[PDB]
Every structure is written in structure tokens, then in C-alpha cells.
RNA sequence: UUAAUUAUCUAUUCCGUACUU
RNA sequence: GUACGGAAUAGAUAAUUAAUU
């Protein structure tokens, strides 16, 4: 024995990872390697679209998204199935500036999460209002802190 | 040696919104 | 003049997984 879990069980063993990384682990057991190809790269520089294809043995599938991370993610998940066979920060800036208040400021108040995934806690400050948010990135903690503050400063 | 993934920093290119002059 | 967001490319740093030497 000592063999790896089934292709269904490995999904539940590491559901926090991308389907790309699970295909990279599964490929070695079957003697295949998931080859990744960029099928499309176009956009109006404001709403672009990308396409990825993945190849595993005698099978290949595609996926798309507004970024190469989202497009590769969709193409990878599709292979496992066959193998199993507006800005809140900007909206706040417009609100604070329209009411005649001073510009907002952002500062990190905490850090957590292991370095392979990370997390952050960010604070927002306004002329008299203050609020906090969190996320896997400083900008992502900022967008959350702004989203909660939009409820604080608005009616 | 090869493949896959997140975060931080720096540089380059493109695009949008608000405020001010 | 100031503030904010999105996509792509390059360099540096930290972390995680699989295969191989």
C-alpha cells in the first residue's frame, strides 16, 4: 500500500490551493505533466480577457478570466473532472471629497497568516471617522476597510 | 534540475473615476 | 497639483507543494 489518496480525496486534502497545483501533484502519479498554453491575450486595457488550455495525457481543456490567474484556474479545474471519469476605495474617496473633508489615509495595524498565503489588517482614517478591514493583501485589506467605512460615513 | 501557488518591494507600459488649478 | 482602482511585462526578497538528480 502507501499509495496516494484518490483523485476525489486529494481535492478535500488541500482545498485551499489552486486546481493547477493539485494537477501538478496528480500528474506525476499518472506519468503525465499538465502543459499550460495561453490561447488568448486581448483587451481594451480596462476589461481584458485571457484564455488558457491545459494538456494531461490524451486530454485537454480550456478556461477564461479577466486575468491570467483566473483564466488558468478555470482551465485546470476542467481537466480534473475528466480525470475523475466599482472600487470601494474610490467610492469612499468621492464621498469624503464631496462633503468637503480631508483626504483619507491608510495604515496597517496587524499581520498574520504564514508567508505562503499571508493576511493583513488595515485601518482607514477620515476627518472624524475611523474603520478597519482585513485581507490577504494590504490593498485587499484596504478595499475591505473602505467598504465598511462607506457605511460609516454615508447615511 | 523541472513544474505549480500566495505575499512584500522596485522599475516599465496601457486604461478608468473623483477633487483642485 | 492631489487621491483611488484595473490589466500586462521585467528584476529582487520570503514562504508552500509534487517529481527528479
UniProtKB/Swiss-Prot annotation:
- DRBM domain location is 18-85, 87-155
Could you tell me where this protein is found in the cell?
Answer: Cytoplasm; Cytoplasm, Perinuclear region; Nucleus
Residues covered by region (Sufficient for interaction with PRKRA)? 10-85, 86-155
**How is this protein organized at the quaternary level?**
Self-associates. Component of the RISC loading complex (RLC), or micro-RNA (miRNA) loading complex (miRLC), which is composed of DICER1, AGO2 and TARBP2. Note that the trimeric RLC/miRLC is also referred to as RISC. Interacts with EIF2AK2/PKR and inhibits its protein kinase activity. Interacts with DHX9 and PRKRA. Interacts with DICER1, AGO2, MOV10, EIF6 and RPL7A (60S ribosome subunit); they form a large RNA-induced silencing complex (RISC). Interacts with IRF7; this interaction prevents IRF7 phosphorylation and activation. (Microbial infection) Interacts with FTSJ3; forms a complex with FTSJ3 and HIV-1 TAR RNA.
Which family, according to the similarity comment? Answer: Belongs to the TARBP2 family.
Question: What function is annotated for this protein?
Answer: Required for formation of the RNA induced silencing complex (RISC). Component of the RISC loading complex (RLC), also known as the micro-RNA (miRNA) loading complex (miRLC), which is composed of DICER1, AGO2 and TARBP2. Within the RLC/miRLC, DICER1 and TARBP2 are required to process precursor miRNAs (pre-miRNAs) to mature miRNAs and then load them onto AGO2. AGO2 bound to the mature miRNA constitutes the minimal RISC and may subsequently dissociate from DICER1 and TARBP2. May also play a role in the production of short interfering RNAs (siRNAs) from double-stranded RNA (dsRNA) by DICER1.
* Name of this chain's protein: RISC-loading complex subunit TARBP2
Protein's organism: Homo sapiens (Human)
Q: Which residues of the full protein are shown?
A: 16 to 227 of 366
